[PDB]
């Protein structure tokens, strides 16, 4: 699971760039302190639900 702060940051990103490319995902990884693969999973999962 990701933290509340990470969720808030990722959701705001998702609502501006719904399909981040690898550079954007690596940047979100650095912003959040999450691995890039975890960023990708989070976006894939959210899009599969929406």
Q: Report the CATH number that the domain containing residue 21 is assigned in CATH.
A: 1.10.10.60
* Technique behind the model: X-ray
Q: Which H helix or E strand runs over 40?
A: helix 36-49
How buried is residue 19: exposed, middle or buried, by Cβ count under 10 Å (0-12/13-18/19+)?
Answer: exposed
Q: Which one, of 27, 19, 23, 26, lies nearest residue 44 by Cα?
A: 19
SS3 state at 50? coil
| Residue 5 structural domain | 1-50
Q: How far is CA 16 from the centre of its chain?
A: 11
Q: Residues with Cβ < 8 Å from 14, sequence gap 6 or more?
A: 43, 46
This PDB structure is determined at a resolution in Å of 1.5
C-beta separation of 13 from 20 below 8 A: yes
Provide the number of structural domains found in the chain.
1
**How many residues belong to the chain?**
50
Cα dihedral: 43, 48, 49, 50 (round 10): 80
How crowded is residue 36: how many other Cβ atoms within 10 Å of its Cβ?
A: 14
């Amino acid at each position: 699971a990701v933290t509340g702060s990470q969720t808030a940051l990722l959701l705001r990103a998702f609502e501006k760039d719904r399909f981040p490319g690898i550079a954007a995902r690596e940047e979100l990884a650095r912003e959040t302190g999450l691995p890039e693969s975890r960023i990708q999973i989070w976006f894939q999962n959210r899009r599969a639900r929406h």
